[PDB]
Amino acid sequence: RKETYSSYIYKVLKQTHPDTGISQKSMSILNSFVNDIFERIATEASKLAAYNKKSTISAREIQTAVRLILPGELAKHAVSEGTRAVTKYSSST
Template identity: 60%
Template sequence: MSDKRQVVAGLEIDGMFEKLVGEAAKLARYNKKPTITSREIQTSVRLVLLGELAKHAVSEGAKAVTKFTSS
């Protein structure tokens, strides 16, 4: 992958992360919670990504959290 393509891919990932965090923050404010929990993150993933991509992302995220907490 060329350097320019890597930069573009990095910017797209950053943009997606900002969308997810922004949506999670809105959900936390709506529910009057002072912090963002895994529930807000999962809901924001489902709202932003949609369909099979959202299901896969939630599944992989849950596996990562389980692996992290069990080690």
């Protein structure tokens, strides 16, 4: 058993470009890319949560981490997409 983000990446390019094939090398490039952003964001959030004497990682910690790591334009697009997704998820009433 080994884990890959291949199907999710596949449907992501299928919403935007249906008639587009993919290379396996390009898939490995993309997998390494998303894993690198994941570990960077996770270590930034864990370091910030340790810095504020708090034992809980919440949405505002990765919010500050995304403000910190990403450059500003892609930062406010990222937090905008995250806020609409989180507010849509939180409406379980």
